Amino acid sequence: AEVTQLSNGIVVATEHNPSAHTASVGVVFGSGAANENPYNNGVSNLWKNIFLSKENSAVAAKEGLALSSNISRDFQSYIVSSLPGSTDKSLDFLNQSFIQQKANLLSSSNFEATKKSVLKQVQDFEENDHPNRVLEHLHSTAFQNTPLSLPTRGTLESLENLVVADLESFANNHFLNSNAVVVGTGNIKHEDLVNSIESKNLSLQTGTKPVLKKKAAFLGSEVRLRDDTLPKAWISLAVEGEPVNSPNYFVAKLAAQIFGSYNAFEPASRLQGIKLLDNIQEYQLCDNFNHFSLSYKDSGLWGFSTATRNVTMIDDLIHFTLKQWNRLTISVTDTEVERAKSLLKLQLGQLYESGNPVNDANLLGAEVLIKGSKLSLGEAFKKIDAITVKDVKAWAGKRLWDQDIAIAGTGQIEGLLDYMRIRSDMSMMRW
Amino acid sequence: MHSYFIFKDLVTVFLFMLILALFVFYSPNTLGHPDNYIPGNPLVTPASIVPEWYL
């Protein structure tokens, strides 16, 4: 239902949803922020703000288009959403302003203005966005000195040393033909998109992207950026999860869905079916937490990110949630895995099917760039409902029993103890 | 204290047990005076009344 056809150059992937209005045509590349050096890092976010600049967005919005882009840890995307009658116009704009000549984008005007803007918004992200920066610090301390350790926004010390030669070399090195998928979602049919792709000669380059030497290997480490002037104590810890296109991928997402999310202030979230909420609600040990399960091209994380105003009982929160983690290996029952199966089906149907045709385009581009053909939602629900409790017990024995964890924190985390107690907490003496 | 200084203390506890086991098993009376093994007779003075070595 979400078809994919490979031409002589590019590969096109679309899903015709004839109920939505705004059709959306873009191109998604398969080399995000884990395909560059630590010395030119931050050139992908800079490319995103080149494409979303004022002049390019004005000469896009005069036509009736709306630009959107997304930089992740393995794919970067460039989406031109538009009206359903206006799709060859959007494809011709994406041809004339990204695939061919980019000299009107890479001026001494546009590049300096957008570099000042990127430096400002990146230092604001470093100063006043605390859970996302400790998630990025967890990524920088888990896969350290291997190229999954780069921040996807870049950092200011590796961003004030960039000129247009590095951006042009990154364009020649990663905006290739064997690196891109042209996505389509909204109410375009497949033959309309591929005929408008076949009419105008739309191909970027010929070669292949450079393979890179280091594999993303997990290293159990610890970092703490303690700021004792902050009100809370954000701290995230995670183990090595499954990568994408691994057979234990849905089991990892299901085990993350077992402990789910929590927010202490909504009254409908203090009543969930999690066993942890009967431990962390007598002294208000945390204000919110959520168990992510990220899966990149080479490796991935699996763990929870919390935030705490009770800055003295941090160790009790870590202790209770790691005992609940060991409960997956020893004594997870069947009613929690059925609850997590239903909630994971709800969450994947919410994520894969929204009214937004840019999240659908980015998901289709990522999972077509990795696998080659995006799997369905009925077959994904079958793969969810074919999971036992011995399967998640075997996965928890493989990846959660006495493994090495990576910890990142900020705020007032002196109440957090040292590393070896938290690492000795990942496996208990059977009670 | 738990996972670090307990093991530091355990290192020096096993070292002290090694030295104490040496001094107990291989040379016990090299610390005490060789006149405490004569039964106490309050008519003979042993010509120097040194106490135990730490006093």
Curated annotation (Swiss-Prot), chain A:
Entry keywords, A to Z: Electron transport, Membrane, Mitochondrion, Mitochondrion inner membrane, Respiratory chain, Transit peptide, Transport
InterPro entries assigned: Metalloenz_LuxS/M16, MPP/UQCRC_Complex, Pept_M16_N, Peptidase_M16_C
Domain of life of the organism encoding this protein: Eukaryota
Membrane topology designation: Peripheral membrane protein
Localisation per UniProt entry: Mitochondrion inner membrane
GO molecular-function terms, A-Z: metal ion binding; metalloendopeptidase activity
Biological-process GO terms, alphabetical: aerobic respiration; cellular respiration; mitochondrial electron transport, ubiquinol to cytochrome c; protein processing involved in protein targeting to mitochondrion; proton transmembrane transport
CC terms in the record's Gene Ontology section: mitochondrial inner membrane; mitochondrion; respiratory chain complex III
Family, similarity comment: Belongs to the peptidase M16 family. UQCRC1/QCR1 subfamily.
Function: Component of the ubiquinol-cytochrome c oxidoreductase, a multisubunit transmembrane complex that is part of the mitochondrial electron transport chain which drives oxidative phosphorylation.
PANTHER family assigned to the protein according to its UniProt record, in alphabetical order: CYTOCHROME B-C1 COMPLEX SUBUNIT 1, MITOCHONDRIAL, METALLOPROTEASE
Subunit structure: Component of the ubiquinol-cytochrome c oxidoreductase (cytochrome b-c1 complex, complex III, CIII), a multisubunit enzyme composed of 10 subunits. The complex is composed of 3 respiratory subunits cytochrome b (COB), cytochrome c1 (CYT1) and Rieske protein (RIP1), 2 core protein subunits COR1 and QCR2, and 5 low-molecular weight protein subunits QCR6, QCR7, QCR8, QCR9 and QCR10.
Note: Present with 19300 molecules/cell in log phase SD medium.
Protein's UniProt name: Cytochrome b-c1 complex subunit 1, mitochondrial
Organism name: Saccharomyces cerevisiae (strain ATCC 204508 / S288c)
Curated annotation (Swiss-Prot), chain B:
Additional remark text: Heme 1 (or BL or b562) is low-potential and absorbs at about 562 nm, and heme 2 (or BH or b566) is high-potential and absorbs at about 566 nm.
Disulfide bonding pattern of the chain: none
Assembly and interaction partners: Component of the ubiquinol-cytochrome c oxidoreductase (cytochrome b-c1 complex, complex III, CIII), a multisubunit enzyme composed of 10 subunits. The complex is composed of 3 respiratory subunits cytochrome b (COB), cytochrome c1 (CYT1) and Rieske protein (RIP1), 2 core protein subunits COR1 and QCR2, and 5 low-molecular weight protein subunits QCR6, QCR7, QCR8, QCR9 and QCR10.
Subcellular location: Mitochondrion inner membrane
Family (UniProt): Belongs to the cytochrome b family.
Source organism phylogeny: Eukaryota, Fungi, Dikarya, Ascomycota, Saccharomycotina
Organism superkingdom: Eukaryota
Gene of this entry: COB
Species of provenance: Saccharomyces cerevisiae (strain ATCC 204508 / S288c) (Baker's yeast)
Topological domain ranges for the Mitochondrial intermembrane compartment: 27-55
Task of the protein: Component of the ubiquinol-cytochrome c oxidoreductase, a multisubunit transmembrane complex that is part of the mitochondrial electron transport chain which drives oxidative phosphorylation.
Protein name: Cytochrome b
Membrane-crossing residue ranges in chain numbering: 4-26
